[PDB]
Amino acid sequence: CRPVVRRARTSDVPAIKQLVDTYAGKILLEKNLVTLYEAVQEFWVAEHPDLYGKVVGCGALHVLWSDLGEIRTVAVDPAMTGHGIGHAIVDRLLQVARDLQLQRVFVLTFETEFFARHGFTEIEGTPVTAEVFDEMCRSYDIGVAEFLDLSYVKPNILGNSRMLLVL
Amino acid sequence: RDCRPVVRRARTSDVPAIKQLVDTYAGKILLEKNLVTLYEAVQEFWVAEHPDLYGKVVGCGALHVLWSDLGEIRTVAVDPAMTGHGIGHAIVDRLLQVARDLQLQRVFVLTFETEFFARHGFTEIEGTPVTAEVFDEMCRSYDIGVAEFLDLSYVKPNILGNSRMLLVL
């Protein structure tokens, strides 16, 4: 299995949404269409080569600061799991992270083994509320960035695990 | 065109240069932008390299996707010492190609540089701007149903009192 992983187009957003909706709830955070469209340039999709490039998976990398990214919304069609599509997507995202000149990537996930294959290690966060987080983000600049590591404080909504990768 | 520069995807390392370009024109000409905004939006940004000066960033531009069929051109800026040589146009050429690649159907822009954008096929349009507060209510409601009747390009607030222009791809 050699999925093609490529940058998303607006035309893939429906398939992305469908993927999210499959797992949305206590596993993945819900996303509406407008949110996805706006984020489209963060998104990569996996194609099924034998099936004419049909989209069977997705993932996103979101930039927080000059040195830090977060992987989000990685999902694979439940009928296509276990063939390396997932790992392919993550591989791509990490390369993008490198190309962008990021130094670290974090993720919030229940799939700790999956991510551990990529070198992610579980860390103990200091999560805050959404409100506190919004305060932090509003103040965020060079000075604040000196002492505040967003990877540690990013809210944990689903109650999953926090993991970190040093590029 | 004098300068046919390399136009490439932004990196986080480029953001200080981008910020410098924006701050050069910010206020009346361009909407200001802090570092955090820029970092988050980095993946929307393209930069123009000086062909001889160690690839130094001498221009920038971005495209922002609003909905399946619509995008907006933002924060296009060129080093003042390097203007009039085709860098601007090279940037916009790229953004427009990105738009097409993305499967956008239309692109808009809010600008004082009307002749510049007209070169790329943009025509002025009669906006019906709303307040920022209203625009935010609109965005919070936005979905397939609303998009049926509400064209965000007509209503996006005009902060700077410039011209509103549209391009059908």
Ligand SMILES: CC(=O)SCCNC(=O)CCNC(=O)[C@H](O)C(C)(C)COP(=O)(O)OP(=O)(O)OC[C@H]1O[C@@H](n2cnc3c(N)ncnc32)[C@H](O)[C@@H]1OP(=O)(O)O
């Ligand atoms: C921020 C976030 O997104 S949080 C992250 C997680 N997202 C989710 O939980 C959403 C719901 N879950 C899913 O969509 C999927 O189950 C995913 C994304 C977790 C995994 O997708 P999969 O496509 O099954 O992943 P992939 O197939 O690459 O790997 C799974 C197993 O297949 C096998 N496999 C791995 N690589 C390959 C390969 N190259 N070729 C063949 N088989 C492989 C391995 O046995 C592997 O197990 P591992 O997890 O121990 O490495």
Ligand SMILES: CC(=O)SCCNC(=O)CCNC(=O)[C@H](O)C(C)(C)COP(=O)(O)OP(=O)(O)OC[C@H]1O[C@@H](n2cnc3c(N)ncnc32)[C@H](O)[C@@H]1OP(=O)(O)O
């Ligand atoms: C959302 C938004 O971005 S709003 C719009 C853009 N932003 C701004 O206004 C920010 C401030 N302005 C700037 O940074 C610049 O002046 C820009 C971006 C508007 C123009 O950049 P430039 O690099 O000067 O663009 P470029 O050289 O391609 O400009 C073309 C003009 O200069 C002259 N010119 C351009 N290329 C050449 C060339 N190769 N040889 C000779 N003359 C040229 C032409 O007269 C042309 O006229 P036009 O304005 O009718 O097209």
Ligand SMILES: N[C@@H](CCC(=O)O)C(=O)O
């Ligand atoms: N990748 C993020 C979007 C990040 C953002 O643009 O805020 C998501 O899946 O929603």
Ligand SMILES: N[C@@H](CCC(=O)O)C(=O)O
């Ligand atoms: N491209 C926009 C940002 C778009 C966004 O909200 O992501 C800018 O010039 O900052």
